[PDB]
RNA sequence: AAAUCCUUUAACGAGGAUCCAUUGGAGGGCAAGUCUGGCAGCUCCAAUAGCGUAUAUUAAA
RNA sequence: CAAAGUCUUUGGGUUCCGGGGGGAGUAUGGUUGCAAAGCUGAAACUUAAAGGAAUUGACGGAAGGGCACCACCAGGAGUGGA
């Protein structure tokens, strides 16, 4: 509420993990 | 890793930034450092001061004076 | 552990060459680099200003 | 150890070198080789490749013409070998980038009198940067002169072209014995191996045949008839044709050669539960009326005008970093939203999974790139896929090509045809390593619209321009800097490096001109690009250590919502804001040195940036290009 | 041999942005900056149409 | 130091043996020994010092003295509690 706030890690692209 | 007989080598880049100019797979005209053999002052089991990087060498890329072919 | 890679080379201010006029490239600079110190030279009592006595 | 066993030693090392190299050249030319292919690039006016190429024809040719251009077979026994010939006018700036790709080797053409000439100085600069197979340099002249101006004319060309080919001699061409002593030079010559195009099959076109499934669909089988010259050209796998887009193909056919070394039937089909398939994206989608509220707390030219207007902004974000003015009647924290300090930019976090547009739903993010590329590098090693092999003469019918690309064919313009590695076609983030050539001396800013040639591909786009450095955290530059090195990125289709970067910008109707030119960096939506904000200051009351700074905000809780970011100080100086004190915007501030009167208080700002989604394929057919 | 170059000579050919001199360095050895900006400019040094760097080798040993 | 002298004013005979410090008296091989080990004896690599004599000033967690109720003792007034 000043300097931060939530911004949570939601949606990714697709990962091709090796 | 050197042509003429198979052994790899760490080598050195002299100038700031000229990392680079070079990718790997490309013909490097690798040359040794003056101490003959021994490492350099700060730089642990290093012995070869790179030239060339492809028949140009270092000193007219790091002043720009020819371009890079590849 | 490759840090950075260039980072004081392209991050000075870029400050460009002014213009003079050409050295005399020869003799002619040998006649000078004579007469700049043997001919007009100043008695100096210690020899403490050099050829780039810069402050 | 001895004179005898290390001699011994030395002759095994000779017979494994040899055997290497006489792997690799008879597989290149010949009885085995599709053809040896060379190119043609004239570079001044004065050359007349027709009386060029009447004198270098002749053993058999075999004639060939297109349209406009005249590509043409040539045969001899004697020497064993195969050339295709093709010729190329420089300035065409999409024919000659388009089949010098596929070339596999230049020959330079040259007027005696100088060296290159500017239209030739272009595309010179342009295939010094996307890879040169193997040049070799010619001349027309030298015979129509004696003796004395003869030598200082080769003296005159070998000073005027030693400043760009710094070595290398200049074969004239005059007589016919003069072209086959050239012949005998071009058959043996040590290729460099470019390596993008040993990784991947790629065809040349040698014929175009066109069947429509309607004629008003536009739409239709095409037919390459070519060579070739890749590794072994798997039909499960796509197609991609240079000028107009990537595309899944239907037929491999194996027709026998028209043209041997000396004088219908198909190896295999398509189908497609293993073929992979045309998914470009992500297939998923009682107060009083009077008092306040305080006692209620007791209860033509304007193209002109946009580039000096460029070139302004240029000078004030070039003499200064970043500066900002700030802004005045809007609330400078609401402007400055999604804005944070970090203490260090090297070292504080940043979280890579935190705030991703509605655009990065949309991208295939590999989760380790180098082993999925040595993966894919070794079955295109090791192992053998059933498709056609090298040098068969092979036709491809495509399934679903348009009709202006075999018009275009049908004027002259070369089609070529590489395949894909697994995950090529699938768009994500292209980060690309790239310089600035002295040629063009434009302003180039941030999401400027460029065309790139990354890795045998032709698309506009709308990149974001980075330092360049192996940290977490890079820099936005809003400007292409003139001399640095930076990492433009892209909404772009996924190609496996190496591959040269070519940009080059629209001056009007059509002169592409050339800005920037480098090799492709590591490809992952992962590499964040922190733009930057500085906001700058004046010192009007000064303690020690304690100061009172205006003309940074304007508010009061503007400081009361940028209060744990830091300052920095062009002295130096690491202070950290206190209290503020003005209804204005005015505030206290801590310090560690003294403080300059001649002094700028400025803070910095940062976010996460990332490029806008522009991959029009189509890239606009380029004129010839002249001088400025 | 026949030429070219060299020599001998007619004609044109010099105002300094030209008919333009580079290569290394400026803490010590070691010659020459506590100059100015964030490696560059300017000045200076040694050599000079040559000077660096690597390697073998010799003197210093 | 009466030899550690007669040594750049460098030559009385003659044996062993040292060439920066580590790696190392390790390897490995030969040899002796019942054995432990002894004798001879590397190199790869690493490092700008390791060492030998002599020579001086701050801190003492070193010791002695000497002073002071902006120290103590004997005590007073207290403050610090509201």
């Known amino acids: 509420s000043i300097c931060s706030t939530a911004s949570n890690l939601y949606n990714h692209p697709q990962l091709i993990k090796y | 890793q050197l042509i003429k007989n198979g052994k790899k080598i760490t080598a050195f880049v002299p100038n700031d930034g000229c990392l680079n100019f070079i990718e790997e797979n490309d013909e490097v005209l690798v040359a040794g450092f003056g101490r003959k053999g021994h490492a350099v002052g700060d730089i642990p089991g290093v012995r070869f001061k790179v030239v060339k990087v492809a028949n140009v060498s270092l000193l007219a890329l790091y002043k720009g004076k020819k371009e890079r072919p590849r | ?55 | 150890l001895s004179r005898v066993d290390q001699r011994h030693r030395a002759s095994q090392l000779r017979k494994q070198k040899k055997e290497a190299v006489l792997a690799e050249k008879r597989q290149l030319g010949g009885k085995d080789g599709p053809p040896h292919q060379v190119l043609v690039v004239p570079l001044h006016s004065r050359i007349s490749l027709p009386e060029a190429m009447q004198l270098l024809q002749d053993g058999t040719v075999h004639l060939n013409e297109l349209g406009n251009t005249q590509n043409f077979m040539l045969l001899c026994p004697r020497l064993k070998h195969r050339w295709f010939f093709t010729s190329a006018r420089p300035g065409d700036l999409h024919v000659v980038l388009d089949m010098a790709k596929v070339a596999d080797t230049i020959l330079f053409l040259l007027d005696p009198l100088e060296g290159w000439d500017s239209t030739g100085d272009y595309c010179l600069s342009c295939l010094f940067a996307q890879g040169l197979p193997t040049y070799t340099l010619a001349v027309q002249g030298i015979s129509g002169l004696p003796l004395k101006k003869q030598i200082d004319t080769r003296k005159k060309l070998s000073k005027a072209v030693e400043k760009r080919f710094p070595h290398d001699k200049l074969l004239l061409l005059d007589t016919q014995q003069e072209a086959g002593m050239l012949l005998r030079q071009l058959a043996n010559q040590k290729q460099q191996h470019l390596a993008f195009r040993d990784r991947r099959a790629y065809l040349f076109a040698h014929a175009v045949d066109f069947v429509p499934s309607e004629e008003n669909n536009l739409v239709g089988t095409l037919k390459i008839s070519g060579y070739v010259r890749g590794q072994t050209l798997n039909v499960n796998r796509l197609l991609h044709i240079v000028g107009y887009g990537d595309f899944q193909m239907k037929q491999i056919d194996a027709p026998g050669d028209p043209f041997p070394l000396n004088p219908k039937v198909l190896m295999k089909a398509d189908p497609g539960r293993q073929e992979s398939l045309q998914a470009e994206v992500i297939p998923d989608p009682k107060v009083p009326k009077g008092t306040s509220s305080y006692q209620a707390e007791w209860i033509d030219e304007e193209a002109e005008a946009k580039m000096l207007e460029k070139y302004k902004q240029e000078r004030l974000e070039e003499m200064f970093p970043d500066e900002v003015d700030t802004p005045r009647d809007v609330a400078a924290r609401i402007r400055f939203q999604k804005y944070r300090g970090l203490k260090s930019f090297r070292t504080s976090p940043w979280d890579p999974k935190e705030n991703l547009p509605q655009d990065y739903a949309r991208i295939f993010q590999f989760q380790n790139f180098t082993n999925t590329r040595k993966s894919i590098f070794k079955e295109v090693e090791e192992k053998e896929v059933e498709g056609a092999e090298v040098g068969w003469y092979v036709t491809l019918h495509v399934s679903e090509v348009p009709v202006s690309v075999v018009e275009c064919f049908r004027q002259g313009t070369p089609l070529i045809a590489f395949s894909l590695l697994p995950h090529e076609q699938k768009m994500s983030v292209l980060n690309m390593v790239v310089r600035r050539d002295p040629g063009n001396t434009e302003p180039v800013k941030a999401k400027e619209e460029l065309i790139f040639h990354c890795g045998f591909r032709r698309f506009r786009a709308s990149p974001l321009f980075s330092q360049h450095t192996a940290a977490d955290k890079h820099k936005l530059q809003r400007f292409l800097t003139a001399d640095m090195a930076l990492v433009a990125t892209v909404y772009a289709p996924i190609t496996f490096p190496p591959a040269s970067v070519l940009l080059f910008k629209q001056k009007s109707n059509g002169m592409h001109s050339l800005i920037a030119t480098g090799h492709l960096m590591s490809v992952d939506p992962d590499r964040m690009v922190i733009k930057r904000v500085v906001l700058s200051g004046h010192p009007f009351k000064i303690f020690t250590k304690m100061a009172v700074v205006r003309y940074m905000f304007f508010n009061r809780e503007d400081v009361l919502w940028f209060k744990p970011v830091e300052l920095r100080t062009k002295w130096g100086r690491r202070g950290h804001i206190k209290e503020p004190l003005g209804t204005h915007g005015h505030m206290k501030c801590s310090f560690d040195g003294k403080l300059k009167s001649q002094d700028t208080v400025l803070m910095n700002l940062y976010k996460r940036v990332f490029p806008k989604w522009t991959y029009d394929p189509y890239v606009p057919e380029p004129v010839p290009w002249l001088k400025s």
Do not use: C, D
């Open chain 3, 1 to 55: 552990s490759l840090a950075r890679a260039g980072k004081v080379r392209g991050q000075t201010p870029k400050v460009a060459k002014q213009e003079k006029k050409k050295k005399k490239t020869g003799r002619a600079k040998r006649r000078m680099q004579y007469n700049r110190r043997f001919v007009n030279v100043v008695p100096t009592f210690g020899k403490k200003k050099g050829p780039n006595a810069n402050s």
